[PDB]
Design a protein around this ligand. Sequence first.
Ligand SMILES: [Cl-]
Ligand SMILES: [Cl-]
Length: 162
Amino acid sequence: MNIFEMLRIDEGLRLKIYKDTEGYYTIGIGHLLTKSPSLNAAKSELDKAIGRNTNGVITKDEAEKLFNQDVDAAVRGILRNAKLKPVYDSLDAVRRAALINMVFQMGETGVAGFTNSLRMIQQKRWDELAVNMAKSRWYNQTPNRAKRVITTWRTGTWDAYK
Ligand SMILES: [Cl-]
Ligand SMILES: [Cl-]
């Protein structure tokens, strides 16, 4: 088990443009295309991203490429963020994967804003953290996913993914 396998599980894989859980144009493996209501604006972003006229459709190899790029940006984002970086450095490997997962889904900004959880993470107060994270839109909107991630944080193992 690793970050790649983890996110593939949580995000699924789809070769056609689609609406995410928030109604956003997305494709491949959780790759957000646009927050805009327009399918054309979405098709346009996708062609720009892929470098070709796709027609709202990509191949497997193309989704994986976007995925690679996205995992990489998440990591680099974390390491560039003043609030995030130290958090990341204080963690074990499984738990660093839980942070990337969240960053992937909600962005640096979203994550950085979970201030109280951040302090707990650092103090390594596992159980409390799990309770705190549950008190969130994130958890209310995508419970099963958030539960997997929260267990990950709580236990430091990959059990939720097995
Ligand atoms: Cl892109
Ligand atoms: Cl869910």
